[PDB]
Amino acid sequence: VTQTMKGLDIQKVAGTWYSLAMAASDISLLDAQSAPYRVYVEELKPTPEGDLEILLQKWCAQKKIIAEKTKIPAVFKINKVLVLDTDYKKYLLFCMENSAQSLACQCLVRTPEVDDEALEKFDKALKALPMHIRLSFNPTQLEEQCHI
Amino acid sequence: VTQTMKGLDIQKVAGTWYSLAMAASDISLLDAQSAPYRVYVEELKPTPEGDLEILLQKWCAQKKIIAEKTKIPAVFKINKVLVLDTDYKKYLLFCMENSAQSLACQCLVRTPEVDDEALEKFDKALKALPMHIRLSFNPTQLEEQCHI
Ligand SMILES: CCCCOc1ccc(OCCCN2CCOCC2)cc1
Ligand SMILES: CCCCOc1ccc(OCCCN2CCOCC2)cc1
Ligand SMILES: [Cl-]
Ligand SMILES: [Cl-]
């Protein structure tokens, strides 16, 4: 992955997000509810020290993890988290990768709605990536624990 | 679905195909190996009477079904099968739909290779359809029973 958000203000991504779409390098990273990269983002909480606290749902448990910051403002560690793109107000695109290469990305949105602009920009960003599974969820599913 | 292949010669789609990509209206139609629309096409055999015999794999059993012809050359019955597009020699795009509306489509290719033109044309055809899961398989997986 070589698309990172230039000049990211991590402070301004704080608050509520919806995992609208997810894609991944291997089907088995996203196919089941229990699949390893099937994580639904609930809230992003940037620390004052510039680390990133993530609230997510995983099959339906609430979970807290911290993405520690790096020399690069758009990259964090946990497995690396890269912020591709965001307008802070509506959408955020990010990716997760390990070091084998297993890779998963998400289109996050602020509200439980189908943002077609945000999905275009998501599909554009995936054209360069070797994804073999893509999921997308409706407004109903977005308002349920673990998108059931 | 309102993209059908004009002037389809069903005779000329006979022989060997590979289920390279699959998309579907609902995740649960494609997520597991046992998912209802997770069918891998092996061979297409058009009858002289103009019906279509389908050999497929389903989780790993071989299976035979006949798609009976209709007044429209690009539409068959089993649940309806619509042939969107094909160049006979390389790719075929089709869709399956019931009457609720549960809908699944496939990019078939002649050989076990990743045809980027055929996937473009597949993605173009899905832009108009309400798909929530898409899968794609590598050359290795294409040469295995049920794409394991
Ligand atoms: C731009 C910031 C968005 C980053 O959001 C996430 C980054 C990494 C994630 O990783 C999930 C890792 C899975 N954990 C271990 C297994 O149980 C669930 C938590 C999840 C969200
Ligand atoms: C252009 C012709 C391609 C059509 O290929 C297929 C059409 C319909 C299919 O339907 C699968 C229905 C599932 N059957 C019942 C459940 O067990 C497996 C067979 C499969 C391939
Ligand atoms: Cl939708
Ligand atoms: Cl591939």
Residue by residue, what is the 3-state secondary structure of chain B?
Answer: CCCCCCCCCHHHHCEECEEEEEEECCHHHCCCCCCCCCCEEEEEEECCCCCEEEEEEECCEEEEEEEEECCCCCEEECCEEEEEEECCCCEEEEEEECCCCCEEEEEEECCCCCCHHHHHHHHHHHCCCCCCEEEECCHHHHCCHHHC
| Of the candidates A14, A17, A129, A8, the residue with the CA atom closest to the CA atom of residue A74 | A8
Contact B28, B43 (CB under 8 A): no
Neighbouring residues of the ion ligand 4, judged by CB less than 5 Å? B 114, 138
CB-nearest partner of B137 from A32, A123, A132: A132
Is residue A31 less than 8 Å (CB to CB) from chain B? yes
Choose one of A17, A65, A87 to mutate for the ligand 1 pocket test, by most ligand atoms within 8 angstroms of C-beta.
Answer: A65
For residue B139, how many other CB atoms are within 10 A of its CB? 12
**The domain A10-134 belongs to what CATH superfamily?**
Calycin beta-barrel core domain (2.40.128.20)
Method: X-ray
What atom of ligand 2 comes closest to residue B94's alpha carbon? 1
Three-state secondary structure call for residue A66: strand
Return the structure tokens found at B5.
Answer: 């292949």
Rg (CA), chain A: 14
Rg (CA), chain B: 14
Amino acid at A25: S
Resolution of this entry in Å? Answer: 2.5
Contact A138, A148 (CB under 8 A): no
CATH 3.40.50.11540 is held by the domain B10-139: no
Secondary structure letter of residue A54 according to DSSP: E
For residue A130, the ligand closest to its alpha carbon is: 4
Min distance A123 CA to chain B CA atoms (Å): 10
> What residue ranges do the domains of chain B occupy?
10-139
Return the structure tokens found at B103.
Answer: 């809908």
The C-alpha atoms of residue A21 and residue A122 are separated, in whole angstroms, by: 8
Choose one of A56, A75, A107 to mutate for the ligand 1 pocket test, by most ligand atoms within 8 angstroms of C-beta.
Answer: A56
For residue B145, how many other CB atoms are within 10 A of its CB? 12
